[PDB]
Each structure stands twice: as C-alpha cells, then as structure tokens.
Amino acid sequence: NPYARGPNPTAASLEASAGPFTVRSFTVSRPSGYGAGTVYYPTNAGGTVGAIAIVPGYTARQSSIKWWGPRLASHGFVVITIDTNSTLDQPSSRSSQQMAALGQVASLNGTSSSPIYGKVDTARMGVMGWAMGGGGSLISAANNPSLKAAAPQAPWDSSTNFSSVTVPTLIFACENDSIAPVNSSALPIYDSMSRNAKQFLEINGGSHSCANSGNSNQALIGKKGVAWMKRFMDNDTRYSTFACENPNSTRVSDFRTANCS
Ligand SMILES: COC(=O)c1ccc(C(=O)OCCO)cc1
C-alpha cells in the first residue's frame, strides 16, 4: 500500500489526544470561494497525504470544528477548517464552499511558497462537517463520488435521501439532539445509503454539539474519525477493525454499520 503512513495503530494510539506526527498550521490568505480557512498539516508524515475539508453548522465558525484539525493532521492528513461566506449559508452552498476549499488545498500543494507544497496527494480527499455542514458534506459526496471518505456529525439537510452517496460514510449522531433530531435527520440519512460502506455512531446523551470542539468523548470520536479516514482515504486495512467494529461502549447509544471491511 503506497498510501500507508505512520506506525501500526492501537486503541491507545487512536484514543490519544495526538497522533504520531507533528502538526503546524496557517491561515489561508485569499480564500477561494469561502469565508476563511485554517490549514493543519503534518511536518513529518514521510510521504504525501490525503486532504480533508471541514465545515461548521448554521451560525457557527471554525472554533466549533477546529479540534479535528490537529487530531486528524497528527495521524497524516492535511486538514482545512473553514468559515463560510455567511454564517447563515445553507447545506448546498456549504458543499460548494467545502469543495472550493479542497480545490484551494490542491492549489497550495502546487504553490512553492506554501507550507504544504508537495505534501498532498490531491487524488485522495475527504469531507467532514457539523449539522448543515454535515449535510453539505453528504451533498459533496453525492456530487463527487471520487471522494474517498465522508464523516459528518449531527448532519442535517432538508432532504434525507442520500441513496446517491457511494463514498464510505461515517455518521456521528448525538442522541438528545434537539436541533437536528436523530429520528428525522441523521438516522434516515444513514438508512438511505445503499451502495457504500457506512456507519452510524450515536453518542449517549449527546446534545447537538456532541462531536464539537470541547466535547467529552474525544477519545472515542477521534479514534473513529481517524480510523475511518485512514481505512478509506489511505486504503489502509491496518485500520479495518477500528473502522468497522462496534466499540461496545457505554458512551454509544446506537451503533450500526454495513458493507464495512
Ligand atoms: C429542522 O432543522 C433545523 O432547524 C436546523 C437548524 C440548524 C442547523 C445547524 O446547522 O445547526 C448547527 C448549529 O451550528 C440544522 C438544522
């Protein structure tokens, strides 16, 4: 596997606050079609890595999703967290902005003054995001089936039919979400997807912000997000158990998975 990076994973190494690589970050000078961005990248991955773009929910900014930047980048990914053009953008616009941010990561990979010059394998990309940004990630996956992985959290879209999605998709859900209730949002979205590796991980007692920065389940949520991205962005079957397993955890009120290997 030419995409495999880093030491062999263990539960401990995936639950830790940081992975094996050192992370640095920068602010995007001229965002291409979105509001603002921060790029997180490993300084010592030892080969090119995939890129992941992460979008917040309605009203929200990078702070809500920023913890993913160092968590993922320290396991060997370039991660861009964005602010949208308006905090009040809807899922479709969020998806366009998310893909523009991936395009700009690809640009920076080819820009000799960038810290990520030659760090990115632009053929291997993923999408994440919270709430309307989670709906935007599912729209991105539907429209761009060559994306390698999606892992939205507490997603919402005014449509729940994502039978279009063929990209491996992990849905984080929050049991007690009152803003995008699981039974009308995350779960029907999950159930709609028929052609992909997929997983549903609902956090016991979680509010709508249960997978955001500052959450109290970073060990489990970070292990699953990293494992999913490693398995599917890097084709890295060292992560197949971590990606596919039911954690059998008292922190999880609902687990489902299909077509996972
Ligand atoms: C029925 O659905 C809605 O009312 C709704 C409202 C807000 C959002 C959202 O993006 O929340 C995340 C906060 O940043 C998603 C769905």
Residue numbers in the entry: 1 to 261
What does the primary publication say about this deposited structure?
We therefore produced and crystallized the double mutant R103G/S131A (DM) for complex formations. A comparison of the wild type, S131A, and DM crystal structures suggests that these mutations did not significantly alter the overall protein fold (Cα root mean square deviation = 0.144–0.2 Å). Soaking the DM crystals with 1-(2-hydroxyethyl) 4-methyl terephthalate (HEMT) and p-nitrophenol (pNP) produced clear densities for both ligands, and each compound could be modeled into a shallow cleft on the protein surface. In DM-HEMT, the ligand is bound in a groove containing A131, H208, W156, I179, W130, Y58, and M132. The H208 side chain is within H-bond distance to the ester O atom of HEMT, W156 that adopts the “B” conformer is T-stacked to the benzene ring, and the other residues provide hydrophobic interactions. The proximal carbonyl group lies adjacent to A131, presumably facilitating nucleophilic attack by S131 in the wild-type enzyme. Judged by its binding mode, the HEMT in the complex behaves like a substrate analog. Therefore, a fragment of PET that consists of two terephthalate molecules linked by an ethylene glycol was docked into the enzyme based on the DM-HEMT structure. The two phenyl groups are located on either side of A131 (or the catalytic S131) with a kink of about 120°. Notably, the conserved W156 residue shows wobbling conformation and only W156 in “B” conformation is favorable for HEMT binding.
Specifically, I. sakaiensis adheres to PET surface and secretes a unique cutinase-like enzyme that degrades PET. By hydrolyzing PET, the enzyme produces mono-(2-hydroxyethyl) terephthalic acid (MHET), TPA and bis-2(hydroxyethyl) TPA (BHET). The enzyme is named PET hydrolase (PETase) for its PET preference. PETase adopts the canonical ɑ/β-hydrolase fold, in which the strictly conserved catalytic triad S131-H208-D177, as predicted from sequence alignment with homologous enzymes that exhibit PET-hydrolytic activity, is found on the protein surface.
